[PDB]
């Protein structure tokens, strides 16, 4: 009988709500009221990068903190040189519709996809010298939204078919598959310890998965609309996400509930990308209204603004050493801020 | 030294990218939409993952994409097509049962934030089927549209055919002109199942879209 399961299900939900309410004795804002404010932070564009023909969605800083790869809808993957603004490589793609990009930890590989439903891996250290397609991973039914390298051999990708799958590049078959999401999966982020990872979907929920097991360890809720971004805290024990409700929320795995939310009356448009600083104190988020806002993660007061673009900001990344911040957009011009 | 190598690395790239700029702007991108019953499969086959089709008319290159491998939900990947020159929209006029769902889809595309500037070229297939269906007197546009009882013309076999076919066209244009500011238009056409003039019709409507862009930046409008 479905009714008894629903009656049993809602009873469990009521029990957990009391348990969460029991632990919800205080608030993060109340405790952090005695710390000094960071003040006003101003940032200026140091370098501007151009040659892209069409709009941009993807961007990722390499571990070397110098090279970075950006993908555009005209079918071109370009690797820059931030220090001296030099185009090192320009790879032509088979399918012009590309929605993601990545940079391998060892610097030897890059990856991308979109609507073609195929994950392509490119080799930048070929014996001949040119770049050729190393491998093509397929079985996904929907488009690809994000993909990250665990190492040279293992790659984890999320698709819009409401499932994520872990691949083995050498074998070319799904070693493990992740399910329970009912809506589209739009973004994921690997943990620092490379053991767990989280993915926010279009049903206002983010799930914590165990890579070794393949089962959803925990489920977090609280948003009102689609979730468009997510990222871990530097210590790996928390994450922050932005939604189309135009509010960012910080969750804690141990406390297993929302801690505090950043929002303002004047902001009525959703977030497209979020990221953290090296120390995690400053939370940078890109908005639809062509600007990025620098939030204080511990006080929620807006601390500065970055208003150098005249079109939607779609990507935002921070270097490993925390020396620079890059914010690509649909203008087709990237801009390295500092 | 290392500096000289970097300069040489660049110099070859801009030459290749410059030629890409030349061919890219020459071609026009079009997006094809319809339903399962709508004859978009027939229309694309008329002038013949994503199914690409390239056809050349009066030495201009056109590139049209058909995406059908996705799921029933389309509120996210539709945003990738905000740069197309126009959106071809095919509708079946001879089936009254699901004509309502077509109107709802058309309204959403028209008012979407990221597609406000994109013109729509509207095709109404199955006109031959519509002529036979009405003359039979089995189904009436009236039982699915009470407004038809009080409509007048603004086909030669019987004027009810003209009243019916124009009435369906009138419904689509009413949504178009109700919420607009002359930055994008609709171009309805009456096409049959077997016609060789579809390619020419797309060329003329694309031509008109370009002129209004060129005139506007030159301040003549």
């Amino acid at each position, epitope marked *: 009988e479905l009714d008894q399961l629903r009656q049993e299900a809602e009873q469990l939900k009521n029990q957990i709500r009391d348990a969460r309410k029991a632990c919800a004795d205080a608030t993060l804002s109340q405790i952090t009221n005695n710390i000094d404010p960071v003040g006003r932070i101003q940032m200026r564009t140091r370098r501007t990068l151009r040659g892209h023909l069409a709009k941009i969605y993807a961007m990722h800083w390499g571990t070397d903190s110098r090279l970075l790869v950006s993908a555009s809808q005209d079918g071109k993957l370009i690797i820059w040189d931030s220090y001296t603004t030099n185009k090192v490589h320009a790879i032509p793609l088979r399918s012009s519709w590309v929605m993601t990009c990545a940079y391998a930890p060892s610097g030897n590989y890059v990856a991308c996809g979109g609507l073609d439903n195929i994950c392509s891996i490119y080799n930048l250290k070929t014996r001949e010298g040119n770049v050729r397609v190393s491998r093509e991973l397929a079985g996904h039914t929907g488009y690809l939204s994000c993909c990250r390298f665990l190492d040279d051999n293992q790659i984890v990708t999320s698709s819009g078919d409401t499932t994520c799958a872990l691949w083995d590049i050498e074998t070319g078959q799904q070693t493990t598959t992740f399910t329970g999401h009912t809506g589209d999966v739009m973004s994921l982020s690997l943990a620092p310890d490379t053991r767990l990872f989280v993915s926010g979907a*279009c049903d*206002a929920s983010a799930k914590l998965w165990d890579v070794r097991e393949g089962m959803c360890r925990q489920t977090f*809720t609280g948003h*009102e*609309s689609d979730i468009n971004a997510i990222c871990f805290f530097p210590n790996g024990n928390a994450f922050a996400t932005g939604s189309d409700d135009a509010t960012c929320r910080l969750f804690d795995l141990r406390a297993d509930q929302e801690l505090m939310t950043y929002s303002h009356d004047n902001i009525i448009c959703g977030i497209t990308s979020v990221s953290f600083s090296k120390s995690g104190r400053l939370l940078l988020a890109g908005y639809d209204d062509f600007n990025c806002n620098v939030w204080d993660a511990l006080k929620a007061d807006r601390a500065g603004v970055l208003a150098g673009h005249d079109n939607r900001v779609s990507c935002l990344g921070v270097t490993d050493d925390g020396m620079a911040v890059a914010t690509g957009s649909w203008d087709s011009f990237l801009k390295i801020w500092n | 030294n290392e500096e000289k190598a970097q300069r040489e690395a660049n110099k070859k790239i801009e030459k290749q990218l410059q030629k890409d700029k030349q061919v890219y702007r020459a071609t026009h991108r079009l997006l094809l939409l319809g339903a399962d019953n709508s004859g978009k499969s027939t229309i694309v086959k008329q002038m013949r993952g994503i199914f690409e089709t390239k056809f050349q008319v009066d030495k201009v290159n056109f590139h049209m994409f058909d995406v059908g491998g996705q799921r*029933d939900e*389309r509120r996210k990947w539709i945003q990738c097509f905000n740069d197309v020159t126009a959106i071809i929209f095919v509708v079946d006029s001879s089936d009254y049962n699901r004509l309502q769902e077509a109107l709802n889809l058309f309204k959403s595309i028209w008012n*979407n934030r990221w597609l406000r500037t994109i013109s729509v070229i509207l095709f109404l297939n199955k006109q031959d089927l519509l002529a036979e269906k009405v003359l039979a007197g089995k189904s009436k546009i009236e039982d699915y549209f009470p407004e038809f009882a009080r409509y007048t013309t603004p086909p030669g076999e019987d004027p009810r055919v003209t009243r019916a076919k124009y009435f369906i066209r009138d419904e689509f244009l009413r949504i178009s002109t109700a919420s607009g500011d002359g930055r994008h238009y609709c171009y309805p056409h009456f096409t049959c199942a077997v016609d060789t003039e579809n390619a020419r019709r797309i060329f003329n409507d694309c031509r008109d879209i370009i002129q209004r862009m060129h005139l506007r930046q030159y301040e003549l409008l």
Partner: nanobody
Amino acid sequence: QVQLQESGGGLVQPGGSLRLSCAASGFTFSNYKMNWVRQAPGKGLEWVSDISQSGASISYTGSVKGRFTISRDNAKNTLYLQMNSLKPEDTAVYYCARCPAPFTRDCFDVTSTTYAYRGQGTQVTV
């Protein structure tokens, strides 16, 4: 979390009337455009009517004009539909969908098979 609970359906003789009410919780009701949808046996989802944010704009499907009236009370955060002179073909299961994103005037994917923000549904038979 977003939750929508429905009630009101039961057996009624032809030509009767029924009152359908849905309660919404977990979000600001005032900012969202609400819809009504139904599914007849052995058929796909069908659209019935919708109401704007403040109720200024109202629309109905052609097959039910002059028989159904849609109203919303933002104060108590509910949606309503009053049905009069029901026909034999009106039997179906009625769900209460909702617009996807806050503030836009477009309602994509509302009639999709697996829409996230939708109610459990109430059966109505004649």
